[PDB]
């Protein structure tokens, strides 16, 4: 008289916190609760009331034949740090599994537009051993943190949490037994560019702009020597930035500004020497005090395509 | 007086990511799954269907005489982080071991 239909599992995910982004590894940490509910065969409980079984005691019930399927985080890195866990067994057959978890999760993250980047933090959940003929997800609900003021937070959550329930078919695996039910949660976020605009981009602009002042010096010697102090100032600034900003395998927006600075100061050095060593006149072409910042900003504009 | 042939083990390895290179230590992290499949002793299973034995229930089957040989990563540095693991036990003696690892 068995029931061979798939077991419908309802899932709720409570996300406490997302943090600890690691840019090079493209990972992030998630702390929260996972709640899974399904209906089994009815049972007798003490006093015909719901029965609570915590932590180690859960293992005793699995040994007695209680079915408690393992649900794997597909995109977790290593074994997640599972805290308290609990089962609730109802007389009518309901079974609810609840667990606190902390894990590091991976996803495709693109930081090229840093510090103005947007990211999709994703949770992917799937049964470890049971295909969708035995265990299928029926619904997914996600509850996040109530935010007071976002100006203090590194990331700003734009929009409600998106969810999906799909099927994953594996070729490497009877017919119709190679398909697993998967839940996908997505939290869209946008970085807080404030800190990076005032402490990094703005001071770097004043530096590059300040380097354009070499054209206002009234001597070749003064123009060429001060340029070297400017160059030294961009290099000293590249260290300050690299020491704080995240490591990546590609350049960001700030990295390109720094390169633009190197190019500006190097270009000015070639112009200072050409003007002075092409003729014997020089001071008049050095009156490019306006032409240089425009050419930089001009190129600076076509870089934004 | 006739010896038994060796047990053949088919292996499938699934590599999720290779990251965390440490140049000085000449190491790197690898996250994935490993599947090993062999034929052992025939056995009875509920309804004669393939049986799924997950995680800590595997050790109960070992204590009662199920053979599960230890497969070692020769070039793993330290004990790898094992997540979920699973045995699929068939009546004809087939065993499929599936485990998540990070090392």
């Amino acid at each position: 008289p068995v029931d061979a239909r798939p077991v419908d599992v309802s899932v709720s995910i409570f996300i406490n916190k997302i943090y600890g982004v690691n840019t090079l590894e493209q990972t992030y940490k998630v702390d929260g609760y996972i709640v899974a509910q399904w209906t089994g065969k009815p049972r007798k409980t003490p006093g015909d009331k719901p029965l609570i079984v915590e932590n180690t005691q859960i293992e005793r019930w699995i040994n007695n034949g209680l079915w408690v399927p393992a649900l794997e985080f597909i995109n977790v890195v290593g074994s997640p740090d599972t805290g308290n866990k609990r089962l609730m067994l109802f007389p009518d057959g309901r079974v609810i599994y609840n667990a606190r978890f902390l894990g590091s999760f991976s996803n495709d993250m693109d930081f090229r537009l840093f510090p103005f980047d947007r990211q999709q933090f994703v949770l992917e959940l799937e049964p470890f051993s049971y295909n969708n003929q035995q265990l299928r997800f029926s619904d997914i609900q996600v509850y996040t943190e109530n935010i007071d003021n976002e100006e203090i937070d590194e990331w700003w959550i734009r929009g409600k949490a998106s969810t999906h329930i799909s099927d994953i078919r594996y070729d490497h695996l009877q017919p119709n037994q190679n398909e697993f039910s998967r839940i996908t949660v997505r939290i869209d976020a946008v970085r807080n560019p404030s800190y990076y605009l005032w402490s990094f981009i703005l001071p770097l602009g004043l530096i590059i702009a300040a380097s354009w002042s070499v054209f206002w010096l009234e001597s070749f010697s003064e123009r060429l020597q001060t340029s070297f102090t400017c160059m030294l100032t961009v290099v000293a600034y590249a260290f300050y930035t690299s020491n704080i900003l995240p490591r990546l395998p590609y350049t960001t927006v700030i990295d390109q500004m720094i390169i633009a600075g190197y190019g500006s100061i190097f270009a000015a050095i070639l112009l200072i020497i050409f003007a002075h060593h092409r003729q014997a006149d020089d001071l008049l072409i050095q009156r490019s005090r306006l032409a240089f910042p425009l050419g930089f900003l001009a190129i600076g504009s076509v870089l934004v395509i | 007086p006739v010896d038994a042939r060796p047990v053949d083990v088919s292996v499938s390895i699934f590599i999720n990511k290779i990251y965390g290179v440490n140049t000085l230590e000449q190491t790197y992290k690898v996250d994935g799954y490993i599947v090993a499949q062999w034929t052992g002793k025939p056995r009875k299973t509920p309804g004669d269907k393939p049986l799924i034995v997950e995680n800590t229930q595997i050790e109960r089957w070992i204590n009662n005489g199920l053979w599960v040989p230890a497969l070692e990563f020769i070039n793993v540095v330290g004990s790898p982080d094992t997540g979920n693991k699973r045995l699929m036990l068939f009546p004809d003696g087939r065993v499929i071991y599936n485990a998540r690892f990070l090392g």
Partner: nanobody
Amino acid sequence: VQLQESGGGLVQAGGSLRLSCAASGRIFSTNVMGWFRQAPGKEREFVATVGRIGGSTVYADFVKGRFTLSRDNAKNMVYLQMNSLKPEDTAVYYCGARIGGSDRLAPENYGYWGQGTQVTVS
């Protein structure tokens, strides 16, 4: 990148079709292509695309094992073998290319859509 769908047409319940999407332009592979559909009045919804790990494929919940995604990286094409059709499947089946992000199931992460192929089940 330019995509062009093909293979649509009319069929009765329980029939079969084989859609094709030809990619022309700068594409790193066909892994980035995914099938979507949009019936009149309904949103454009995900149908299928390759999985992150080799040998895996992501299918919408309504597929129920009926459709099967395949690819010819040489010819730079992906195929969708649709079987056991039903009236509910009538829609315009587009072909998108994942433009980034980590939600293969999200149309917002796709672009370079094609003109679309009409499929109608009676």
